[PDB]
Design a binder for this molecule. Structure first.
Ligand code: HEM
Ligand code: HEM
Ligand code: HEM
Ligand code: HEM
Lengths: 141, 146, 141, 146
């Protein structure tokens, strides 16, 4: 459950991320596949090589989904209903993997935002990602 | 932990540039801010009421130096993390009863701090090697629970 | 995130507890204290002996908060804000302990309401308890 | 796992009443229903589309008997769980890569099934004894990760 301060931090931080969202999503995915190889079994038909166009394209989709969540932070279940169906009902992703991707996104943000990844921002973004993870791993239709 | 010759090389090189006086306190400080229930184990440390109080807390900084010193110990004994952390495992498990997931959290917060400090230098390959190290450390600290 | 079916299952099962509120809440706490001794650190001044009058009175409050949570299932953050202040801001309970008490509540329900504790209901109750747990461990005020 | 003589006797007595052809399947089926993501590991079992389909799935019941059996072997070797489960640990960790949290979930589901079957007979003290057993089992299964 995000407080008003968390929401403000998430909207400001993601706003800072800005046009680099797609790139960060792709880097987060790459860090995940390398750091936690078991996650790769979820992407059997993907070219997961460093810099693959497929991962960059997918990173963009992930980013845009997060941007959408940020813009509907007070009503994420509704805004992410289709993604929840995909991850929770169809793919049945173990929730542990969401902790891994979230951690890799935080590591990516930290690596790219030396001037803005403050402890409060880090804390609000962690809660935001945990909230998104809960929605995507829940079957609520 | 595993760690290939090259990974060990990468890990060692990056650690040589880590501030022994600050990074530990930053990792412990961020753990206290991001996962607030962990403050329950540090009441004697003083004011932890705001991110600023936590990050500037003198006790958090000093204590963090010891925490960092323990990671340095592990890095110098990658082939025997369990033995190296034996004393700390009995402390965290038998005396303090810290839930092991928290060991995992602090390790990931440390990774975030290393990423914060090194920027682009904290490449995916370098992170992957460090993930093996923090996982080894968390497992070693939780040993008394196994 | 609870589905409509989850809410229907939870209200149908929990509603059968009724006046057993204190007894069952008290039993869940006792199971937790005996099964996971570390949880006792949260109740230093409490008499945790078997038929403790203190445990019984407290168990009744726990069970009634759950009944309340069930009624405001779609508005838990607001309904349980005071409990959040208590567990997250004041007590700083480690989230792991909520999984422990939730499991002990499920055991208690399974031991007393066998006809009601079907696999579907068990699944809905776990999600409901997990949701209550998130609210109580989050600082959103 | 350390069970006092009294706990060991209570655990043994109860287990002797367990239906060896049903309880395993009930525990495994509830694991797949309560924690749906675990189904990803058992898609070869066929239809697992709904709670009733899972619980009535013949392969879930059959595999369930094996799981119950491993638990039985565990109860017969509380002194040496690591060794008893060494092979299963390689299978579940090195091959299937099952996150260890799931081992804990299955143990707790089994506990819910025992409670479901024995009702008031599954007293708080008996549960405490069984929690030591299932935590030891999960621990031994995750041994290859330690
Ligand atoms: C922050 C959490 C995540 C977000 C917001 C997210 C978002 C998305 C989006 C937007 C898509 C593309 C959907 C489309 O094509 O319309 C997708 C697909 C997918 N996601 Fe995620 N996802 C997340 C975490 C995960 C995790 C942890 C895994 C597994 C390790 C995962 C596995 C997949 C897979 C396998 C696909 C399908 C790819 C394909 O076959 O085309 N996702 N995700
Ligand atoms: C995972 C890495 C961790 C390492 C390497 C580590 C390291 C240390 C070390 C070196 C000490 C001091 C030992 C001494 O010289 O006396 C210590 C004490 C302690 N640690 Fe940790 N620790 C870790 C995680 C944790 C976590 C996750 C918690 C709690 C959420 C925690 C809470 C404590 C407490 C309560 C004490 C200090 C007691 C006091 O002075 O009041 N530790 N730790
Ligand atoms: C299902 C989740 C839980 C619910 C619904 C719940 C509910 C409550 C309620 C209603 C109160 C009593 C307020 C009053 O006196 O009116 C309370 C107090 C308390 N709870 Fe919880 N609680 C939950 C989980 C936990 C957990 C997991 C722990 C720790 C193991 C915990 C520790 C405490 C403590 C220490 C108190 C204060 C007792 C005292 O000193 O008076 N609670 N809780
Ligand atoms: C208490 C923990 C568990 C025990 C005692 C246990 C026991 C077993 C046993 C006895 C086998 C078959 C061994 C053989 O004869 O080859 C097995 C297989 C397997 N287990 Fe587990 N298991 C446990 C938890 C889990 C969990 C939590 C998952 C996954 C979420 C899992 C996934 C599997 C799979 C995929 C197989 C192979 C089944 C097949 O396709 O035939 N197990 N387990």
């Amino acid at each position: 459950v995000l407080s008003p301060a968390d929401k403000t931090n998430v909207k400001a931080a993601w706003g800072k991320v800005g046009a680099h969202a797609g790139e960060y999503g792709a880097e987060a995915l790459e860090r995940m596949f390398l750091s936690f190889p078991t996650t790769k079994t979820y992407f059997p038909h993907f070219d997961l090589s460093h810099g693959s166009a497929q991962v960059k394209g997918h990173g963009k989709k992930v980013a845009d989904a997060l941007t959408n969540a940020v813009a509907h932070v007070d009503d994420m279940p509704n805004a992410l209903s289709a993604l929840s169906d995909l991850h929770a009902h169809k793919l049945r992703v173990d929730p542990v993997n969401f902790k891994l991707l979230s951690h890799c996104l935080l590591v990516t943000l930290a690596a790219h935002l030396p001037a803005e990844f403050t402890p409060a921002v880090h804390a609000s973004l962690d809660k935001f990602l945990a909230s998104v993870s809960t929605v995507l791993t829940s079957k609520y239709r | 932990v595993h760690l290939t010759p090259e990974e060990k090389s990468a890990v060692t090189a990056l650690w040589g540039k880590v501030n022994v006086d600050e990074v530990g306190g930053e990792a412990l400080g961020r753990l206290l801010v991001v996962y607030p229930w962990t403050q329950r184990f540090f009441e004697s440390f003083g004011d932890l009421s705001t991110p600023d109080a936590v990050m500037g807390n003198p006790k958090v900084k000093a204590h963090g130096k010891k925490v960092l010193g323990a990671f340095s110990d592990g890095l110098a004994h990658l082939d025997n993390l369990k033995g190296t952390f034996a004393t700390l495992s009995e402390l965290h498990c038998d005396k303090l009863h810290v839930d092991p997931e928290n060991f995992r959290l602090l390790g990931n917060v440390l990774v975030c701090v290393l990423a914060h400090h090194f920027g682009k230098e904290f490449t995916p390959p370098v992170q992957a090697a460090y993930q093996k190290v923090v996982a080894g450390v968390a497992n070693a600290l939780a040993h008394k629970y196994h």
